[PDB]
Each structure stands twice: as structure tokens, then as C-alpha cells.
């Protein structure tokens, strides 16, 4: 991949992408305004980066999100399009760093950085299998 | 009060794995069955929200306005993730936190989280202004 490369990913926010939907298990969240959850924003940012990386992964490889550092500065109701822009900022070993940003057509809603590590799925799968209850 | 450690325990169910974050995403649908960064962020917000609720006034709620955390080990369903939230400061409407999370086997992440106290209906209305007809 090339440092500086950009990718864009558009997402119309549905009704099941609001705060209460990230954790139906939470009574503490049932009171919240019907807005796009930060956790769902984080997911959409990761998703953009994943799509950007996909062409460049050898067979048997995947990636994990290893860090997320973002602000969430405006709220987004269902119906608006969230556009995430992902810009590759640096690569070092199995590690990639992206500058990510998100706009909902009306406001910039957040931005920051996201780090991923390329992994070998089946070695990783074995490890996650030995931590399994 | 500042320095106070609030603990929050959560048994990870199958429906908090990566593919469950975005069932819309074909990319996520093949990911390993591990607790998603986006769900960890929501869990960290949940811990802080519970820690705050006593202290809000009627009609008050809060929103996460920033998150900056690592995600350093993977968690299969069945483990309990314990979030530890510690209050760093209260400045006006802003509450600042150090958060960390552990799955009973490894520490899985840590960093910082900020939240803003809001007037629930006063905010819901602002969101209406952005809500498409």
C-alpha cells in the first residue's frame, strides 16, 4: 500500500445503528437519544480500513484493530449518510496506521487515528481457541 | 470523585463478535469470533455512564465525545470482560476518564475516554434539526 492513499466508504445510518442497539442488554442505554453510537462509528471506520487493505493481503492473512483514537463531535440521526475517509499514514512491519475522518453530510462528526496489525488467521485462530472457556 | 475506581463486568456472548457489529459487512462476516473493538468502546462508555448516573440531575444524560484506547488481546465469547473506569477530572460539563479492560486472562486494552453532560431533551431537539423528513 502507499502512504497517503485515501479510501472512502459511505453508509446511510439505519434505525438499528443507534446507541440502544449497540447494547440492548443495557438498561443504562435505553434512555439515550436515537443517535449513531460511537462504537458503530468506530466499526465503520475500521470497516473502511479493512476494505482498503484487502487487495494487499496474502491468502491466509487477516487483520486486527489494535488501537482507536478518535473524537466524536456531532451527533447523527438515522437517515443521514456517514462518509468515512481513511488515509494511510504509516506502515511499520505488520502494522498500519490510518488517519480516519467521518462526516454525516451536515457536520463533521469525528476523526482521529486507527492502527491495525496483519495476522495469520489460523495461528491466531489456534490462540483464540486456547483462551476459550 | 476523582481517583475513584468503578468496575464493570460483562460476560461476552456470541452476539458481540465482529460479524455482529456490522451484519451488513461481508468483510466482517468471516472475521474470527472475537469481541469487536466497537463493542469494547461501547462497554467502556457503559462503565463510565453507570459511574455517573447518580450524579446527574433530572433530565440530564451524557455523550461520549472522545475515546483513545489500545486493543491488545482478543476475547472469545464466554470470558467476562471487566472494565475499570477511573475518573480523572470534572471540568464544567466535561468528565474525563482513564479506562482499562481485562478478560480474566489478559488485559485487552486501556486508554482514555471523555464524556459531556447534556440536557436530554435540549439535545434530542438539536438532533431533530438534522433529522431528515
- Write the DSSP assignment of A44-65 as a string of letters: HHHHHHHHHHGGGPPTTEEEEE
Alpha helical stretches, state H, A25-120: 38-53
Inter-residue contact B68 to B75 (CB < 8 Å): no
How was it solved? X-ray
User: B91 to chain A nearest CA, in Å?
Assistant: 17
Phi, psi of B13 (to 5 degrees): -90, 170
- For residue B44, give the H/E element and its range: helix B37-52
Sign (positive/negative) of CA torsion A129, A42, B45, B112? positive
A94 to A6, A23, A64, A97: CA distances (angstroms): 19, 32, 10, 10
Residues 6+ apart with CB under 8 A from A36: A13, A17, A18, A75, A76, A77, A78, A82, A104, A109
| Domain A1-133 is found in CATH 3.50.40.10 | no
What Rg do the C-alpha atoms of chain B give, in angstroms?
A: 16
User: Is B45 in the active site?
Assistant: yes
User: A3 to chain B nearest CA, in Å?
Assistant: 22
Judged by CB atoms closer than 8 Å, whether chains meet at B38 and A39 is answered as yes
CA terminus-to-terminus distance, chain A: 38
Of B4, B8, B24, B45, catalytic: B45
Judged by CB atoms closer than 8 Å, whether chains meet at B38 and A33 is answered as no
- For residue B36, give the H/E element and its range: none
CA terminus-to-terminus distance, chain B: 43
User: Is A8 in the active site?
Assistant: no
A65 is in an annotated binding site: yes
Of A21, A61, A66, A72, catalytic: A72
A100 is in an annotated binding site: no
Amino acid at each position: 500500500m502507499r502512504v497517503g492513499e485515501r479510501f472512502t466508504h459511505d453508509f446511510v445510518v439505519p434505525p438499528h445503528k443507534t446507541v440502544r442497539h449497540l447494547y440492548p442488554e443495557s438498561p443504562e442505554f435505553a434512555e439515550f437519544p436515537e443517535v449513531f453510537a460511537t462504537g458503530f462509528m468506530v466499526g465503520l471506520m475500521e470497516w473502511a480500513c479493512v476494505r482498503a487493505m484487502a487487495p494487499y493481503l496474502e491468502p491466509g492473512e487477516g487483520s486486527l484493530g489494535t488501537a482507536i483514537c478518535v473524537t466524536h463531535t456531532a451527533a447523527t440521526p438515522p437517515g443521514l449518510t456517514v462518509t468515512v475517509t481513511a488515509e494511510l499514514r504509516s506502515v511499520e512491519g505488520r502494522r498500519l496506521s490510518w488517519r480516519v475522518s467521518a462526516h454525516d453530510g451536515v457536520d463533521e462528526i469525528g476523526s482521529g487515528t486507527h492502527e491495525r496489525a496483519v495476522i495469520h488467521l489460523e495461528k491466531f485462530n489456534a490462540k483464540v481457541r486456547q483462551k476459550t472457556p
